Amino acid sequence: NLIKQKMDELIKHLNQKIVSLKREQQTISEECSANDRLGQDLFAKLAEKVRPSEASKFRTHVDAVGNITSLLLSLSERLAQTESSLETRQQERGALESKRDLLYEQMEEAQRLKSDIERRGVSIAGLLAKNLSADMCADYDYFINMKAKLIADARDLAVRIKGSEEQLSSLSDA
Template sequence: MFIGDLDKVTSLLLSLSGRLIRVESALDCVDPETGHHERLQLLEKKKQLLVQMGEAQELKEHVDRREQAVGKVLECCLTPEQMRDYSHFVKMKAALLVEQRQLDDKIRLGEEQLRGLRESLGLGLGVGMGYGQY
């Protein structure tokens, strides 16, 4: 149960931070003169995400306290080597979730770039040049 909660909280933090980055990026791209309404909406979204991020941080702190409590109980039941393995597993679980999210984001970005490239090549080169004709 603790490991499942660790997965969920880590995924939540990663999701919120990714959304926050996208909102901040969108804010940077808004035209200051014409995008006043859009800017207000993005600022409100950023505010909501920051509140959610704070709540997620509190959940993470709670999970960290549970991790320490579980560790104390397991120290009585496991050998020192087993305890090291358990501690390593918990640390790696979170690190691998972060790495998986980064890889998923890179794959998604690559797919978007590939799709855009295909569309631009299909629109720019395929028309009237004999490409794609049998």
């Protein structure tokens, strides 16, 4: 509601900006044509006095100046871009490393907890053995182990499914 309100504004200001930039670049273009005319006059007057090869060399020097200027600027820009992207990658990597630290601590905690649960499980086995038939006990063992196993399998299938769904989405989208 109010987001389109701001967005329209931004888009507008930005269009105005781009139009201005266009204008300025036009001005510069004109100045370029003028200066080129100057160079043309120069080359004519020099073409009068000197040998053809010398005039040619003059011309190629004049072109070369512009060329190497544009080249240097281009490489400068590209370099800058690359630097920027690298820095970005670095920040991202830092974030990921932190996330990893966290995951790890949580894992250690989870392990501690699992050990605890294992001992408790010893206790439970004790309780069942003291209160239920051998059959019922073997049945419990089977039950608990199968519970774990089934959870595992289920998560595996959940993952495979999820991922494959991602793949599909990406393909179909193309």
